Design a protein around this ligand. Structure first.
Ligand SMILES: Oc1c(Br)cc(Br)cc1-c1[nH]c(Br)c(Br)c1Br
Ligand SMILES: Oc1c(Br)cc(Br)cc1-c1[nH]c(Br)c(Br)c1Br
Ligand SMILES: [K+]
Ligand SMILES: [K+]
Ligand SMILES: [K+]
Ligand SMILES: [K+]
Ligand SMILES: [K+]
Ligand SMILES: [K+]
Ligand SMILES: [K+]
Ligand SMILES: [K+]
Ligand SMILES: [K+]
Ligand SMILES: [K+]
Ligand SMILES: [K+]
Ligand SMILES: [K+]
Lengths: 209, 209
């Protein structure tokens, strides 16, 4: 209990457009807020949208903190990290554009994160996927990554230190953890944990809700 | 001109539910029918749904043929193959659940198929995809395959012969071509070439049309 710090990424506005009268960002916010394991939520957002979350500070059973977004995703994660409790045992990074994440699946990835040191929710890739070389020729089990991405703070800090001191290039595919020798566990999630951005995605969310 | 035999897979009913008053299967049917390169379309469908395509036989500028569906996808392809013109230089296999395929992209994959011997329409995978081992740990450029999948008939026949004589297992991922040493080219397609099956997918198709 109270061992997990959530970093909620909401500074990328697609994540504020409403879902049944509630801005998309608030759905996972509340999901995390109700979990006894969660000590605090560090919201990473433009100071302008701070009010959206601030209104509920008294009603929620977690600590609320704020951090400023960075240039790209890893910078926003670093910003959030600077704000987490000194004693938290787990960092739970979540894309707020993912509103329908189930409590049971968050529980699963937290458990796997605590056990392994790093865990991410994923589902088997439904599409037929092939590796293709530079000559556009096919190179003769694949999983789609979701969020939360759960990592012990010491490991995350070491990962940032490794990238900075060596000047390593970070992309969405080649993230901080890809450079570490520490294992990353894939917790099996639900296909309903979609990223809601396009109008096509938003009508699906209502059906799931 | 008149060098390509299309195998239209329509015996898998999701592919007959209407799109703006026209059954989904008829969209690519007509797209192929208008291309001068296409000699014939072999429709692979339950004899029950033969009428859907038969009504237009006189108005279309291609030969129409019919074949019986098999147990799985490769069996249906084999069935269609038995019906193609003895002199066609290219087989163009298409999933009829893909209605919005553009003429320009079909032209592209036919060209690449003629050049290389085998080509498939694909798009870069938008999702973050990782390889995961048997212990559910991340294994530290990926493309999503679409259709048409274009192959020279001799190569396709050899591929079927290789699988039968050796008793090789065929899956959607490990298809006939995966066993051949002959190169497969990935022609860059459009994200609009979606597989239309779910109600969520059908409303998207109208927007694209
Ligand atoms: O890409 C991953 C994965 Br596959 C698993 C975990 Br656990 C964390 C990250 C990650 N993503 C960002 Br952005 C940062 Br920083 C980190 Br660490
Ligand atoms: O899976 C592919 C690919 Br990636 C490229 C081409 Br060209 C053809 C196939 C294929 N699919 C089936 Br079903 C059969 Br039979 C064959 Br051959
Ligand atoms: K709590
Ligand atoms: K979601
Ligand atoms: K959310
Ligand atoms: K979920
Ligand atoms: K364990
Ligand atoms: K999407
Ligand atoms: K024609
Ligand atoms: K399509
Ligand atoms: K079609
Ligand atoms: K297309
Ligand atoms: K060429
Ligand atoms: K789909």
């Amino acid at each position: 209990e109270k061992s997990v710090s959530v970093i909620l990424l909401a500074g990328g506005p697609k994540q504020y457009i409403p879902l049944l009268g509630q801005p998309i960002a608030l759905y996972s916010f509340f999901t995390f807020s109700r979990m006894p394991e969660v000590k605090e939520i560090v919201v990473v957002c433009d100071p302008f949208f701070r009010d959206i979350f601030e209104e509920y500070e008294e009603s929620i059973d977690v600590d609320l903190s704020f951090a400023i977004p960075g240039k790209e995703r890893q910078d926003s994660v670093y910003s959030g990290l600077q704000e987490i409790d000194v004693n938290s045992e787990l960092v739970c990074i979540h894309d707020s554009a993912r509103p329908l994440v189930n409590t049971e699946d968050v529980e699963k990835v937290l458990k796997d994160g605590s056990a392994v040191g790093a865990a991410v929710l994923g589902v088997p890739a439904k599409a037929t996927i092939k590796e293709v070389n530079s000559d556009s020729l096919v190179v003769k089990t694949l999983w789609e990554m979701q969020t939360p991405q759960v990592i012990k703070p010491e490991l995350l800090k070491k990962g940032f230190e490794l990238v900075k001191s060596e000047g390593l290039e970070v992309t969405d595919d080649v993230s901080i953890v890809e450079y570490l020798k520490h294992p990353v566990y894939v917790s099996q999630g639900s296909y309903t944990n979609i990223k809601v951005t396009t109008p096509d995605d938003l009508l699906l969310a209502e059906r799931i809700l």
